[PDB]
């Protein structure tokens, strides 16, 4: 079998690995980093909270999610930006020029969920390129799916991605798990390489 | 004994867990979910580090810790609101209504805290269920003993609740461990069942 | 060999120290805590998105990393203050009187900075306690070197340390890891022992 020592080894290894962003990637569209939403070029906030402000008010501190969200890494449930209905998409700038080989999503979990349930997750995504800084012809670099069913974070790595490098990139959503009103994106980040 | 692998598996479960607000049950109480403080219903703030503002001064960006810290997840040494004296309450507005099975109180460790001590922790406390939103008779949910010597996070499982619903409780500090001028609440948890 | 349920003490110990802020140590640097830092006798700020705030620009949100951030447990790529070249300081009011047995420096781990290195990590330092409260001859509480091979977090004991107490200490940055333009530190910690 295993020693009491090399049971110590593992867990300090697996804690090492957790205490590197949970999965041990470069974050390039990770705000703190210099990455930022492009405003201009985001679908229209929805706010998930409606009901509750409507019925009992708008607190003196409160405002609604922005785009901004989905590169900051609090995702404590409701910490998300919000869309109306199932296709939205974001486009971010990335911290840095880099050879995109991974993108990662992640939502709230389903323990955290009423019932146990995340409808609002987003389903089938697609990631774009933008070349240049214009709205332009965005060159997809790779289209999936997440998994409602699987781990709360989950990356998603190129089929043979080019060489060619990128610091704009959108997230497209295309379906979300069924909510009938909104999709809410906790956190999206970019990996791959740069200079 | 055990394998290499099966000690994987374990670790991975453990970090899941870990990763899942620590026990793994949804807060209904959380501020981000869309819970508030009723501040009209809350002691009145005690400012814990008024030594260190009248020697030292006020900060420019400084502020006190208002009831809403305790819905809020950060609970690093200080990130905790205080009121004065060892009895206190504060009334949470829940994100949700809600059958409440239970309740979860946390304290900064020891091991974080000068001299391993946290006399102002709470100690005694019950839970109240408000039906109608009015400062009315609240409805004893149940009486616990926060533990001093136990966990840094403690859930407390009511007896033999109804299946009444509630979306306002109200946090019922009756006792401290011992600090002779204020009590401080690092989070205040709500766990049960919506609709 | 280890039994099932031996792995699973195990790892919940490892995770309860995880949990107290990685190294189970009281912070007297750490500002929720009642420490700050003396702007007055800190080096001068370097902004190190100049590059990115150039060429897009400065967002409506956008804020300079000031000494503050050095004792705030949010380090996350960034997240870090930086000064200019290889040499600076900065001087901490910890939140208590203490005999101060021990430091923490921590930097970005590697694996989630750009081409796995940190140059702008800090290398050779020393600490200073001051005994009165005015820039006066601090007195060397110990010389020591930031490891960029090492893990992330670095705990430095003095070495014979004096009985003799201070609420007000210098780090002071002597070298750096080889980046050209600037050294940036992104959590700065005091042990020891209070009254
Ligand atoms: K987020
Ligand atoms: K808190
Ligand atoms: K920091």
Known sequence: GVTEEQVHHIVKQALQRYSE??????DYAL????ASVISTR?????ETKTALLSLFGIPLWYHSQSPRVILQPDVHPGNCWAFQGPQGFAVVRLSARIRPTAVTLEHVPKALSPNSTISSAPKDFAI???DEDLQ??????????????????????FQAPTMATYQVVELRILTN?????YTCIYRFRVHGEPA
Chains 1, 2, 3 share one sequence.
Do not use: N, V
């Open 21 to 26: 962003d949970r999965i041990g990637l470069a």
């Open 177 to 181: 798990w069924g909510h009938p009103e």
């Open 42 to 46: 985001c679908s229209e906030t929805y």
């Open 31 to 34: 705000e703190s980093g210099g």
């Open 128 to 130: 774009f390129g933008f």
């Open 136 to 157: 332009q012809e965005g060159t997809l670099l790779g289209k999936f799916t997440y998994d409602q069913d699987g781990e709360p974070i989950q990356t998603f790595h």
